[PDB]
mmCIF file of C-alpha atoms and ligand atoms in Angstrom:
data_model
loop_
_atom_site.group_PDB
_atom_site.id
_atom_site.type_symbol
_atom_site.label_atom_id
_atom_site.label_comp_id
_atom_site.label_asym_id
_atom_site.label_seq_id
_atom_site.Cartn_x
_atom_site.Cartn_y
_atom_site.Cartn_z
ATOM 1 C CA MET S 27 191.411 131.703 237.932
ATOM 2 C CA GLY S 28 187.620 132.411 238.661
ATOM 3 C CA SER S 29 186.971 132.090 242.600
ATOM 4 C CA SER S 30 187.888 129.357 245.228
ATOM 5 C CA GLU S 31 185.805 127.672 247.895
ATOM 6 C CA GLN S 32 187.468 129.399 250.550
ATOM 7 C CA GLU S 33 186.697 132.772 248.625
ATOM 8 C CA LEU S 34 183.295 132.279 248.230
ATOM 9 C CA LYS S 35 182.855 131.080 252.066
ATOM 10 C CA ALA S 36 184.126 133.743 253.540
ATOM 11 C CA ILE S 37 181.740 136.077 250.928
ATOM 12 C CA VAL S 38 179.123 134.463 252.107
ATOM 13 C CA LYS S 39 179.425 134.893 255.611
ATOM 14 C CA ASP S 40 179.601 138.532 255.141
ATOM 15 C CA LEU S 41 176.804 138.847 253.388
ATOM 16 C CA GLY S 42 174.895 137.292 256.442
ATOM 17 C CA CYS S 43 173.862 133.710 254.980
ATOM 18 C CA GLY S 44 175.685 131.968 257.399
ATOM 19 C CA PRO S 45 172.677 130.999 259.271
ATOM 20 C CA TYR S 46 171.710 129.100 256.746
ATOM 21 C CA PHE S 47 174.410 128.415 254.341
ATOM 22 C CA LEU S 48 175.907 124.519 254.259
ATOM 23 C CA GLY S 49 178.364 125.384 252.289
ATOM 24 C CA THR S 50 180.435 124.877 249.177
ATOM 25 C CA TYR S 51 179.778 121.101 247.122
ATOM 26 C CA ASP S 52 181.051 119.543 244.240
ATOM 27 C CA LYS S 53 178.407 117.706 241.785
ATOM 28 C CA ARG S 54 177.384 115.224 244.497
ATOM 29 C CA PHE S 55 175.661 117.939 246.530
ATOM 30 C CA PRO S 56 173.001 115.658 248.659
ATOM 31 C CA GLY S 57 170.150 117.755 248.721
ATOM 32 C CA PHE S 58 168.544 119.350 251.432
ATOM 33 C CA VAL S 59 167.675 117.702 254.761
ATOM 34 C CA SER S 60 166.102 120.586 256.414
ATOM 35 C CA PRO S 61 161.855 120.467 256.647
ATOM 36 C CA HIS S 62 162.437 123.197 259.138
ATOM 37 C CA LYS S 63 164.734 125.633 258.431
ATOM 38 C CA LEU S 64 165.812 127.656 255.197
ATOM 39 C CA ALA S 65 169.215 126.528 253.779
ATOM 40 C CA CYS S 66 171.016 127.196 250.772
ATOM 41 C CA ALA S 67 174.376 126.219 249.150
ATOM 42 C CA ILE S 68 177.046 126.527 246.477
ATOM 43 C CA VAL S 69 177.423 123.893 244.334
ATOM 44 C CA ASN S 70 179.859 123.203 241.228
ATOM 45 C CA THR S 71 178.877 121.090 237.788
ATOM 46 C CA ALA S 72 182.092 119.271 238.388
ATOM 47 C CA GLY S 73 183.884 116.692 240.522
ATOM 48 C CA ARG S 74 186.027 117.717 243.155
ATOM 49 C CA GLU S 75 188.645 115.267 241.156
ATOM 50 C CA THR S 76 188.417 117.800 238.752
ATOM 51 C CA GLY S 77 189.361 121.533 240.752
ATOM 52 C CA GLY S 78 186.194 123.181 239.873
ATOM 53 C CA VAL S 79 184.270 124.403 236.636
ATOM 54 C CA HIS S 80 181.631 126.263 237.004
ATOM 55 C CA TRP S 81 179.280 127.684 240.264
ATOM 56 C CA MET S 82 175.663 127.402 240.592
ATOM 57 C CA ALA S 83 173.468 128.575 244.287
ATOM 58 C CA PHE S 84 170.910 125.966 245.279
ATOM 59 C CA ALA S 85 168.356 127.335 248.201
ATOM 60 C CA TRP S 86 165.582 125.688 249.939
ATOM 61 C CA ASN S 87 162.581 127.630 251.584
ATOM 62 C CA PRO S 88 160.911 125.111 253.875
ATOM 63 C CA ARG S 89 157.613 126.659 254.315
ATOM 64 C CA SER S 90 156.990 127.209 251.021
ATOM 65 C CA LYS S 91 158.773 123.966 249.858
ATOM 66 C CA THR S 92 160.178 125.540 247.371
ATOM 67 C CA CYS S 93 164.276 125.017 245.871
ATOM 68 C CA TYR S 94 165.582 127.745 243.997
ATOM 69 C CA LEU S 95 168.525 126.710 241.381
ATOM 70 C CA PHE S 96 170.117 129.842 240.450
ATOM 71 C CA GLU S 97 172.978 129.041 237.691
ATOM 72 C CA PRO S 98 173.869 133.113 236.282
ATOM 73 C CA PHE S 99 173.534 131.772 232.502
ATOM 74 C CA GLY S 100 169.965 130.495 233.126
ATOM 75 C CA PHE S 101 170.476 127.584 230.780
ATOM 76 C CA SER S 102 167.919 124.802 230.340
ATOM 77 C CA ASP S 103 168.495 121.647 232.087
ATOM 78 C CA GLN S 104 169.592 120.170 228.406
ATOM 79 C CA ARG S 105 172.356 122.665 228.447
ATOM 80 C CA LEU S 106 173.065 122.008 231.744
ATOM 81 C CA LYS S 107 173.597 118.333 230.506
ATOM 82 C CA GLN S 108 175.472 119.469 226.971
ATOM 83 C CA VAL S 109 177.501 121.934 228.084
ATOM 84 C CA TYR S 110 178.634 120.843 231.686
ATOM 85 C CA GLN S 111 177.580 117.003 232.563
ATOM 86 C CA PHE S 112 175.796 118.191 235.142
ATOM 87 C CA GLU S 113 171.926 116.578 236.419
ATOM 88 C CA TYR S 114 170.828 117.249 239.926
ATOM 89 C CA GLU S 115 167.497 115.232 239.825
ATOM 90 C CA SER S 116 168.927 112.836 242.208
ATOM 91 C CA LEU S 117 169.518 115.425 245.072
ATOM 92 C CA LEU S 118 165.686 116.977 243.937
ATOM 93 C CA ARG S 119 164.809 113.845 244.658
ATOM 94 C CA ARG S 120 166.413 113.679 248.286
ATOM 95 C CA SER S 121 165.651 116.801 249.088
ATOM 96 C CA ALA S 122 161.985 116.214 248.276
ATOM 97 C CA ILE S 123 161.855 113.191 250.313
ATOM 98 C CA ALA S 124 163.916 114.061 253.825
ATOM 99 C CA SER S 125 162.554 117.803 253.884
ATOM 100 C CA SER S 126 158.707 117.525 252.359
ATOM 101 C CA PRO S 127 156.262 115.649 254.121
ATOM 102 C CA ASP S 128 153.939 114.937 250.779
ATOM 103 C CA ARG S 129 157.449 114.260 248.681
ATOM 104 C CA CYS S 130 157.227 116.987 246.735
ATOM 105 C CA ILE S 131 158.418 120.365 245.993
ATOM 106 C CA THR S 132 158.271 123.383 243.691
ATOM 107 C CA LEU S 133 161.572 123.848 241.729
ATOM 108 C CA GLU S 134 161.887 127.429 240.881
ATOM 109 C CA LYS S 135 165.088 127.958 238.457
ATOM 110 C CA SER S 136 166.267 130.929 236.706
ATOM 111 C CA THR S 137 165.775 130.881 232.649
ATOM 112 C CA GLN S 138 168.070 133.935 231.952
ATOM 113 C CA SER S 139 171.761 134.890 231.878
ATOM 114 C CA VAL S 140 172.956 137.473 234.784
ATOM 115 C CA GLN S 141 176.593 136.658 233.012
ATOM 116 C CA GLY S 142 178.684 137.468 229.848
ATOM 117 C CA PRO S 143 179.625 134.587 228.230
ATOM 118 C CA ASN S 144 183.485 135.220 228.133
ATOM 119 C CA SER S 145 183.115 136.035 232.235
ATOM 120 C CA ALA S 146 184.712 134.549 235.175
ATOM 121 C CA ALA S 147 182.707 136.062 238.108
ATOM 122 C CA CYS S 148 179.759 132.973 238.095
ATOM 123 C CA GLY S 149 180.620 131.889 242.344
ATOM 124 C CA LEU S 150 180.113 135.551 242.554
ATOM 125 C CA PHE S 151 177.143 135.859 241.354
ATOM 126 C CA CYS S 152 175.881 133.078 243.255
ATOM 127 C CA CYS S 153 176.799 134.763 246.290
ATOM 128 C CA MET S 154 174.515 137.733 245.419
ATOM 129 C CA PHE S 155 171.888 135.172 245.083
ATOM 130 C CA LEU S 156 172.178 134.004 248.555
ATOM 131 C CA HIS S 157 171.841 137.774 249.804
ATOM 132 C CA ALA S 158 168.490 137.806 248.063
ATOM 133 C CA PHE S 159 167.627 134.561 249.452
ATOM 134 C CA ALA S 160 168.839 135.096 252.736
ATOM 135 C CA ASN S 161 167.055 138.512 253.199
ATOM 136 C CA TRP S 162 163.785 137.751 250.620
ATOM 137 C CA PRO S 163 163.368 133.664 250.179
ATOM 138 C CA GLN S 164 159.453 134.025 248.535
ATOM 139 C CA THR S 165 161.144 136.284 246.043
ATOM 140 C CA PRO S 166 164.753 135.821 245.618
ATOM 141 C CA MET S 167 165.258 135.918 242.114
ATOM 142 C CA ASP S 168 163.715 139.259 240.739
ATOM 143 C CA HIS S 169 161.743 141.957 242.748
ATOM 144 C CA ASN S 170 164.136 142.230 245.873
ATOM 145 C CA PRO S 171 166.385 145.014 246.616
ATOM 146 C CA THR S 172 169.893 142.706 245.785
ATOM 147 C CA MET S 173 168.593 141.418 242.505
ATOM 148 C CA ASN S 174 166.675 144.851 241.205
ATOM 149 C CA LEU S 175 170.284 145.467 240.512
ATOM 150 C CA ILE S 176 170.555 143.198 237.464
ATOM 151 C CA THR S 177 169.169 142.410 234.967
ATOM 152 C CA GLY S 178 168.821 138.817 233.097
ATOM 153 C CA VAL S 179 168.657 138.271 229.748
ATOM 154 C CA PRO S 180 167.724 135.202 227.251
ATOM 155 C CA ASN S 181 170.595 133.265 227.132
ATOM 156 C CA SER S 182 170.158 132.833 223.010
ATOM 157 C CA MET S 183 170.801 136.557 223.323
ATOM 158 C CA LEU S 184 174.297 136.527 225.029
ATOM 159 C CA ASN S 185 176.741 136.877 222.074
ATOM 160 C CA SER S 186 174.780 140.330 220.569
ATOM 161 C CA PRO S 187 175.283 144.007 220.751
ATOM 162 C CA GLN S 188 171.926 144.661 221.931
ATOM 163 C CA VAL S 189 172.452 143.375 225.368
ATOM 164 C CA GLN S 190 176.250 143.909 225.695
ATOM 165 C CA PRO S 191 175.143 147.202 228.185
ATOM 166 C CA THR S 192 173.373 145.480 230.251
ATOM 167 C CA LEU S 193 175.833 142.569 230.923
ATOM 168 C CA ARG S 194 178.778 145.021 231.597
ATOM 169 C CA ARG S 195 176.397 146.639 234.269
ATOM 170 C CA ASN S 196 175.409 143.332 235.952
ATOM 171 C CA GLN S 197 179.414 142.624 236.700
ATOM 172 C CA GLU S 198 179.873 146.284 237.626
ATOM 173 C CA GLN S 199 176.940 146.540 239.910
ATOM 174 C CA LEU S 200 177.773 143.014 241.242
ATOM 175 C CA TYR S 201 181.222 144.247 241.977
ATOM 176 C CA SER S 202 179.936 147.220 243.814
ATOM 177 C CA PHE S 203 177.626 145.263 245.484
ATOM 178 C CA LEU S 204 180.334 142.983 247.457
ATOM 179 C CA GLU S 205 182.217 146.015 248.222
ATOM 180 C CA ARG S 206 179.322 147.780 249.912
ATOM 181 C CA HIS S 207 178.604 144.772 251.649
ATOM 182 C CA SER S 208 181.768 142.404 252.032
ATOM 183 C CA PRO S 209 184.978 143.025 254.059
ATOM 184 C CA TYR S 210 186.758 140.365 252.600
ATOM 185 C CA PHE S 211 185.594 141.385 249.238
ATOM 186 C CA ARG S 212 186.984 145.204 249.907
ATOM 187 C CA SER S 213 190.262 143.193 251.014
ATOM 188 C CA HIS S 214 190.907 141.624 247.839
ATOM 189 C CA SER S 215 189.410 143.568 245.905
ATOM 190 C CA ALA S 216 192.284 144.156 243.013
ATOM 191 C CA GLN S 217 193.113 140.309 242.823
ATOM 192 C CA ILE S 218 189.289 138.867 242.593
ATOM 193 C CA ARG S 219 189.062 141.972 240.332
ATOM 194 C CA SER S 220 191.090 140.626 237.949
ATOM 195 C CA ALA S 221 190.203 136.877 238.950
ATOM 196 C CA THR S 222 186.843 136.951 237.793
ATOM 197 C CA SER S 223 186.525 139.598 235.173
ATOM 198 C CA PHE S 224 184.129 140.288 232.442
ATOM 199 C CA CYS S 225 186.429 139.624 229.609
ATOM 200 C CA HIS S 226 188.498 136.939 231.519
ATOM 201 C CA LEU S 227 187.823 133.765 229.219
ATOM 202 C CA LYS S 228 187.969 135.471 226.206
ATOM 203 C CA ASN S 229 189.496 133.576 222.915
ATOM 204 C CA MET S 230 192.889 134.794 221.530
ATOM 205 C CA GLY O 20 166.874 140.105 238.228
ATOM 206 C CA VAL O 21 166.275 136.921 236.503
ATOM 207 C CA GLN O 22 162.962 135.528 235.449
ATOM 208 C CA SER O 23 162.246 131.967 236.416
ATOM 209 C CA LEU O 24 160.270 129.094 235.576
ATOM 210 C CA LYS O 25 158.394 126.913 238.375
ATOM 211 C CA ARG O 26 157.330 123.091 238.123
ATOM 212 C CA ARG O 27 155.933 120.924 240.347
ATOM 213 C CA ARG O 28 157.951 117.682 241.703
ATOM 214 C CA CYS O 29 156.513 114.943 243.496
ATOM 215 C CA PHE O 30 158.597 112.024 245.080
HETATM 216 C C1 2UQ A 24 182.154 130.926 236.742
HETATM 217 N N1 2UQ A 24 181.923 131.912 235.382
HETATM 218 C C2 2UQ A 24 184.118 130.699 236.568
HETATM 219 N N2 2UQ A 24 184.274 129.505 237.272
HETATM 220 C C3 2UQ A 24 185.309 128.887 236.953
HETATM 221 C C4 2UQ A 24 185.838 129.112 235.947
HETATM 222 C C5 2UQ A 24 187.059 128.011 235.754
HETATM 223 O O1 2UQ A 24 187.762 128.548 234.677
HETATM 224 N N3 2UQ A 24 187.443 127.008 235.986
HETATM 225 C C6 2UQ A 24 188.759 125.882 235.738
HETATM 226 C C7 2UQ A 24 188.155 125.200 234.532
HETATM 227 C C8 2UQ A 24 188.858 123.470 234.681
HETATM 228 C C9 2UQ A 24 188.441 122.576 233.627
HETATM 229 C C10 2UQ A 24 187.311 123.112 232.582
HETATM 230 C C11 2UQ A 24 186.599 124.574 232.475
HETATM 231 C C12 2UQ A 24 187.026 125.315 233.726
HETATM 232 C C13 2UQ A 24 185.703 130.365 235.013
HETATM 233 N N4 2UQ A 24 184.263 130.527 235.278
#
């Protein structure tokens, strides 16, 4: 359940990200070594020895020296460490030393959730954010034709009724986007919908 | 889309 690496690699290639995509990685992703080229990756919070827990997307624009982090719940760094034991200082330091003459970068990280609290669609949301980054690498988080299809909410409000229509609609728009843009998703639509559904993780 | 925070980082 959730999405495998093979699934996410096929979808990212369908979305046109292939020229800049480094691949899928576990939490040891080393960072970007790319002072002159756009690059991006999908990175799990856990190590490969666990089989995967949660997907994030990292992307890098060499001309603005900006590393983007899109994690679908928009957790603070403290909550990423609390919930997922994930920290990414090392990969940011490697990226700045390898890819910027001044050893300085801007980190731009999402602060809102797009995903519902029982959903298993994290990897698919990362693939949609990387279509936006490959096409609008100066404004991938919002104000572009892909990310305008979905709406972030404060992660503190996730279990409140006033945001449930928005989170449902976000996952419906993610699947419609992947039907339009990914022949892999089209050919696997039912299977992936069932494995990643909005309430796939709901307590019983 | 999502709102975001920008932080300058120097190494
Ligand atoms: C994305 N929303 C997402 N990705 C993966 C899973 C999942 O259930 N992974 C397996 C796992 C193993 C150990 C501990 C927790 C989860 C769910 N959602």
